[PDB]
Design a protein around this ligand. Structure first.
Ligand SMILES: Nc1nc2c(ncn2[C@@H]2O[C@H](COP(=O)(O)OP(=O)(O)NP(=O)(O)O)[C@@H](O)[C@H]2O)c(=O)[nH]1
Ligand SMILES: [Mg+2]
Length: 452
């Protein structure tokens, strides 16, 4: 017959915004994630039903790595609520195509739908990748425009660039695992990269055991081979279902995966203004399917003409370099280039909880990055009759004497000099610099410091 294409479709939104009901209406043609399937044209669509509740947002994050498309639901009448945004954020950081779906249109008037419709359009424009994503009102109960919703899901998939990675090693996470006996265990999960054929030897991590694929169940059917993008049921032998829990990852023996403690990421910030750069900060880092508490130290990479140095952020977010050395409390399974998600989940469900996202560049501890502090103190040149004295670099005599012999330039005048001695008990300074110095000139003291 015809060749089908394997598609994962997310469904996100606030609690009671009509996710599940939309799910059921699609399937026929929430603590954990829901899993279902339906066909549209030659698209085999495996539905990922995300939990609305905000204590379950761990599931929501972990529902993103799988999907190539999503539906964000929002009640017509009461419009977007708090979770609607974090789901929106999450998908936007991970560059997942969305279709905003306005549910419960039968419970609202034309006016109230148009309002909420526009409110969404306003919001979508405040997001990087989701800038303009279609919007349809539907009623799952009434069937209103459900027909269109499907025709859109088709169009969207026809446009979106879906890259199945067959080439790299087999890499697949494990959602649920349930036993049969001591010599067998069945694990489910959608395949990230690579290929598996029945009777292959793979391995569970982080526990690092070696098992063999007895069965591939895909789409309620037993097949010899599975590919990346397929959500498969998998029976393997050489492990008990007890050892395998939420964070386990099934992959081949050529894997690039590593169990990691220290992470260095290239961080982009979600909302600037909610963002703060006070280093050595306590957050909850999302890697893979886990959430590990962490400490982050933001920094930038500035070439000084010879050697590139890692400089603790000067608080300027101008230019896109907010690298972040993470140090995790627990361990985590990661690879280079894996998208990382910085969250603060300590907060109430009522406030946006995403402290940003980024690509993992290196696995490296803060200590070996050679972190350094850009150090600037600013004084003024005060000149009386026959004497030049710099003021403001030092508050007292000791502070001043410690400064003697440092580097000093004058702002805007392209001139250099050196600070020789201390003048006064109030911490003034003397210097020998190039001539043509003037009163009320600006003196910029510059040096590199050991940070923390
Ligand atoms: N009139 C109407 N009611 C709807 C529609 N979709 C959902 N509802 C109602 O909304 C309520 C919650 O629906 P549900 O799909 O379970 O929401 P959910 O997002 O799955 N809940 P959760 O976030 O807990 O998983 C139910 O009372 C359901 O009947 C719809 O299209 N029309
Ligand atoms: Mg539900």
């Amino acid at each position: 017959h015809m060749d089908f294409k394997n598609i994962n479709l997310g469904i996100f939104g606030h609690i009671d915004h009509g996710k599940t009901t939309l799910s059921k209406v699609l399937t026929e043609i929430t603590i954990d994630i829901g899993f279902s399937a339906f066909k549209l044209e030659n698209y085999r669509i495996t539905l990922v039903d995300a939990p609305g509740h905000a204590d379950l947002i761990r599931a929501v994050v972990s529902a993103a790595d799988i999907i190539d498309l999503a539906l964000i639901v929002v009640d017509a009448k009461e419009g977007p609520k708090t979770q609607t945004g974090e789901h929106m954020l999450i998908l936007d950081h991970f560059n997942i195509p969305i279709i905003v779906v306005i549910t419960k249109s039968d419970n609202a008037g034309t006016e109230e739908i148009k309002r909420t419709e526009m409110i969404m359009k306003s919001i979508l424009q405040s997001t990087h990748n989701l800038k303009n994503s279609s919007i349809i009102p539907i009623s799952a109960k009434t069937g209103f425009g459900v027909d269109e919703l499907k025709n859109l899901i088709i169009t969207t998939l026809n446009n979106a660039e879906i890259i199945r990675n067959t080439e790299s090693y087999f890499k697949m996470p494990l959602d649920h695992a349930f036993p049969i006996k001591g010599a067998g265990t069945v694990v489910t999960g959608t395949i990230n990269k690579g290929i598996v054929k029945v009777g292959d030897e793979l391995k569970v991590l982080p526990i690092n055991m070696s098992t063999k694929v007895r069965s591939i169940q895909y789409f309620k059917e037993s097949v010899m081979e599975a590919k990346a993008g397929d959500r498969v049921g998998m029976a393997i032998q050489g492990v008990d279902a007890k050892q395998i829990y939420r964070g386990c990852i099934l992959t081949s023996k050529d894997t690039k995966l590593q169990t990691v403690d220290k992470i260095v990421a290239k961080i982009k910030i979600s909302d600037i203004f909610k963002y703060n750069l006070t280093p050595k900060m306590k957050v909850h880092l999302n890697v893979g399917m886990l959430i590990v508490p962490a400490v982050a130290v933001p920094f930038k990479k500035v070439t000084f003409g010879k050697t590139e140095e890692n400089i603790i952020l000067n608080e300027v977010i101008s230019g896109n370099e907010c690298y972040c050395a993470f140090e995790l409390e627990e361990k985590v399974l990661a690879e280079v280039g894996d998208r990382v998600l910085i969250t603060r989940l300590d907060l109430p469900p009522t406030t946006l909880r995403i402290c940003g996202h980024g690509l993992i560049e290196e696995f490296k501890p803060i200590k070996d990055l050679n972190i350094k502090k850009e150090v600037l103190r600013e004084g003024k040149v005060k000149i009386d009759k026959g004497r030049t004295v710099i003021d403001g670099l030092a508050q007292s005599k000791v502070a001043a004497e410690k400064l003697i012999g440092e580097e000093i330039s004058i702002e805007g005048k392209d001139i250099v000099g050196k600070i020789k001695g201390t003048f006064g008990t109030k911490g003034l300074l003397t210097a020998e610099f190039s001539g043509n110095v003037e009163n009320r000139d600006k003196v910029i003291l510059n040096r590199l410091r050991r940070w923390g």
